[PDB]
Design a protein around this ligand. Sequence first.
Ligand SMILES: O=[N+]([O-])c1ccc(O)c(O)c1
Ligand SMILES: O=[N+]([O-])c1ccc(O)c(O)c1
Ligand SMILES: O=[N+]([O-])c1ccc(O)c(O)c1
Ligand SMILES: [Co+2]
Ligand SMILES: [Co+2]
Ligand SMILES: [Co+2]
Ligand SMILES: [K+]
Lengths: 221, 221, 221
Amino acid sequence: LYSHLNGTNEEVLDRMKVAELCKGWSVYRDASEWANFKEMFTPDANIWTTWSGAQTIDSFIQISKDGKDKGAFIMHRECGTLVDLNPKTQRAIGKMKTTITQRFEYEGVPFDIDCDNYFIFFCLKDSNGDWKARWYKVFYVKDKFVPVGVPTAENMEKLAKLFSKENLEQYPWGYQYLAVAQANLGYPIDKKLPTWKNELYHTMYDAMKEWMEGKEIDLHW
Amino acid sequence: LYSHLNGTNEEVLDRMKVAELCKGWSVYRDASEWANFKEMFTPDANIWTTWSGAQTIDSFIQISKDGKDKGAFIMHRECGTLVDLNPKTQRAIGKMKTTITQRFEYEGVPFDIDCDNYFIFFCLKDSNGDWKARWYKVFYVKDKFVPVGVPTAENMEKLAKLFSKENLEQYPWGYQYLAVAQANLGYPIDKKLPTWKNELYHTMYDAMKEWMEGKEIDLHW
Amino acid sequence: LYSHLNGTNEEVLDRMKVAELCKGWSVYRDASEWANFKEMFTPDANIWTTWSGAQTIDSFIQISKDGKDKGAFIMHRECGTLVDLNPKTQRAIGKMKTTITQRFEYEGVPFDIDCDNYFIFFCLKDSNGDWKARWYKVFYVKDKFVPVGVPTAENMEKLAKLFSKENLEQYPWGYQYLAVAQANLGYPIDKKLPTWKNELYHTMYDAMKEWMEGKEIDLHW
Ligand SMILES: O=[N+]([O-])c1ccc(O)c(O)c1
Ligand SMILES: O=[N+]([O-])c1ccc(O)c(O)c1
Ligand SMILES: O=[N+]([O-])c1ccc(O)c(O)c1
Ligand SMILES: [Co+2]
Ligand SMILES: [Co+2]
Ligand SMILES: [Co+2]
Ligand SMILES: [K+]
C-alpha cells in the first residue's frame, strides 16, 4: 500500500524529490560533480557496483576519482524513474532504470559495453526533512557488445577473442559482457549481484519490502 | 491552448502525476509489477502494440504474462516525457518517447531490435481526482537491428537471411525490423499502427485533439 | 550554494518546471511541434548545434524546418535531467543528458550516428514568472557509428571509406562520427563546441557560474 501514482500534493512532491536524487547518479557522477553526488546519500551510505563491490559512499567517491584519473570512462543513460513511498515510515524506494555504458579499447579497437539495469535507491527522510539514500544496489538485466567504429571483419575477429563463450560464462547472465570488459581492464568483479535470472533477485525484493516497513536491513551478502 | 510548460502550481502537479503514470510502462511492465501497471489505467482501458494488436488492459496483462512465461523479453528505455493538459476538461495527453528493446535469437545468435517511438497516453482525471489512461497507442518512428555478441562475419550472414529486404518491406517503415523479429517468434503483427510516414499519423493527432476537448474517441481502426 | 535536491516546495516546483522545459527539446523538436518548442525560449534566445553553429531561436526553427523538408532525420533520447537553481537571482541551469541519434545513408546503406552529450539550458524567470531559456549549448562527450541493417562484411567495407581515421580526426573528439556524417550530408560543422577533452569545457563551466550569479554572458566564441 505504497504511494507511487497520484496521491496527495505532499506525496507527489516527496516522489519528485526522490526521483531527482536517483537521477543525480547519471547527471553528477558522469560529470564528476562529486559534492552534488555526495548530497544524494546519508553520511554512512553503502554502494555496490560490478567493478567496486561493496563500498561506503566516501570510499566509492575516492576510488571513482582514481579510476577516472586513470582513464576509466563510464556513463549512464537514465531510462525511466519512479518511486515507491511510505509516508507513515518516511521511507522510499527509488527505481531508476538505466543503461551503464562504458567505453573500452582492445588491441587498438574501441568499443562500448551497454548494460540495461535497475538502480535501486533505499531512501529515508532525515532529521532535516531531506530525502537521502542509505543503500544503493543494482538489478542487472541484460547487456551487449557495442561497436564504436564501423564493424569491419578484421577488427571484429580480434575482439571476438576477448568475448569468448568461456569468458562470458564466468559471470552472471545480465552483466557478462560488462564483467569481461571490466576484468580485462584489471577490475575485480563482484559476482554476487542481483540479476533477473539468479536467486539474489528475491533477496533484493525482500530487503526492499523490509526497508519500506521502517526496518533495518543489510545488503552485505 | 493547453498547459504544458510553466502554469499554475496545480497544473504543474497534474503534469507531474501524468508524467509518472506514463513512465509506469517502462518501470512496471519490464519488472512484471502488474498491480502497479494496472493502476495506470481505467478499468476499461484499451491498448495497442505491434505484437498484440488491440487489447483491453486486462487481456493485455494476461497475454503479456503468458508471453513472459514463454520467454518473451521486451524492455523499454524512456527517452523524454511531457504532458499536454487541459484543466477545463480534466483531460491530458502524455507523450513518452521510448526505445522498445526486445531480445531475440536466430540460429543460435542473440540480437536485439531497438525501435524508437512515442507512447501516447490518453488520460483523464477520474471520480477520485486520480489521473488514469483510457487509451494507449504508439507512433513508431524508426528501428534497427542491434548485435549482442561481437558481430563476426559468419554470424551476421545467418541473420541476414531473416532480415531480407522482402521481409522488411512487408511492414510499415518505422517498425519493420521489430515486426520481422516478432513475426519470426510467431506473433501476429498489427500493420495498421501510426508511424511518422504513413497516413495514420494524422488520424492519431486528430484523436488527440478531440480527446483534449473532452470528447469521446475510438482508436479501433 | 544552489538548490538542486530537496529544498522548499517552491524550489521543487521551479526545478520541475525547468526540467520540463529542457525535455521539450527531445519531445517537441523531434515531433516538429514548433510552437511548443519556441515556448521553451526567450524571444532573443541563442542556440548552437554542430550542424547549424550559432543561431537565434527563430533562425534555428526556420533552418530546422528546411532541413526536415529535405530529409534530415535527427532524434534525441533524453538520458537524465536535473536543475541547478538560484532562487535569489531567479536563474537556473538545466542539465539534460541526451543521445543525439541521426539517421543517414551512404552508398545505399542506412546507419545512425549516436552522440552522448549534456544539453545545457541557461534559464531565467521572466516578467510573467515563467521559466525560459536564453542560451543553449552542448557538451559533446562521446559518439559512435551505429549499424541499422545486419552488419555484413560487404556493407561495412563501403561505410569504412567514409569514417576513415583522417576524416574523424578533423573534428573534436566527442562528436567526430556525427561531424563526419553531417559534413557528408553537406552541413557546415562548428568545430568550436565544448567537449569533455578540449579547453572549451572550462569556458562553459565559467559561463554557467556567471549566469547563476545573475550576470550577463555571451557564448558567441
Ligand atoms: O557508477 N558506475 O560506474 C557503475 C554503477 C554500477 C555498476 O555495476 C557499474 O559497473 C558501474
Ligand atoms: O509493451 N510492450 O511490450 C510493447 C509496446 C508496444 C509495442 O509496439 C511493442 O512491440 C511492445
Ligand atoms: O537538435 N538537434 O538537431 C541537434 C542539437 C545539437 C547538435 O549538436 C546537433 O547535431 C543536433
Ligand atoms: Co547542494
Ligand atoms: Co498502488
Ligand atoms: Co503553450
Ligand atoms: K529518460
